[PDB]
């Protein structure tokens, strides 16, 4: 009796996802799907917050996945804010949801997709060995989470 709706924001059009998902919901497993596709053409945080809070206040929803196509580096923390205080799982797939996060709350069962900041350096080091680039120097800004990058290199 638990359904996982999906929220989508942007100009991308996707209607038949529910029809495919309902037929691809792994009916052999007791999932009770209640997937709802909700779309809206603004990225205002509080306006999105009101829609999210009201999403499971009316009906019974215990899980949400946010999809977006934008460069705004502030939407991910909002889900963390909601998921920390409201004990509901949140999963990130695309857009602002899938990006590097400095640190989450102590009790926040929030998860995202995408490579970690540590894994980025490791793969980057494994491409500068086949092409023999052994002489290099590093320049970076004061963007948060940059301290471990140089520390990863030296380790």
């Amino acid at each position: 009796s638990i359904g996982i709706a999906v929220i989508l924001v942007g100009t991308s059009d996707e209607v038949a996802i529910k029809d495919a998902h309902e037929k691809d919901d792994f009916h052999h497993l007791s999932v009770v799907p209640r997937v709802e596709l909700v779309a809206m053409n603004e990225t205002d945080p509080k306006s999105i917050i009101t829609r999210i809070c009201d999403l499971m206040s009316d009906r019974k929803i215990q899980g949400v996945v946010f999809a977006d196509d934008t460069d705004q580096e502030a939407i991910a923390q909002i889900l963390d804010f909601i998921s920390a205080q409201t004990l509901t799982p949140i999963l990130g797939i695309h857009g602002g949801s899938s990006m590097i996060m400095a640190d989450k709350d102590e009790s926040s069962m929030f998860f995202q997709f995408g490579p970690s900041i540590e894994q980025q350096a490791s793969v980057m080091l494994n491409i500068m060995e086949e092409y023999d680039w052994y002489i290099f120097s590093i320049v970076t800004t004061y963007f948060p989470g940059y301290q471990d990058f140089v520390n990863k290199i030296r380790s």
């Binding site: 945080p45 509080k46 917050i49 009101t50 809070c53 502030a74 923390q77 909002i78 804010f81 205080q85």
Partner: protein
């Protein structure tokens, strides 16, 4: 919990330039100081504790 949406609508909409956030009457809680800074973060609005 609802202050997150209760701050911008009641205060930011008034064409403000900065936010002055007070201290919770409780001796020590994160309930008050946390949401009062998330709302201003999207627009980089300064907040003063």
């Amino acid at each position: 919990i609802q202050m997150a949406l209760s701050v911008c609508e009641d205060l930011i909409s008034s064409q403000v330039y900065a936010i002055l956030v007070s201290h919770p009457p409780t001796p020590n809680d994160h309930f008050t100081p946390t949401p009062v800074s998330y709302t201003a973060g999207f627009y980089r609005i300064p907040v003063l504790g």
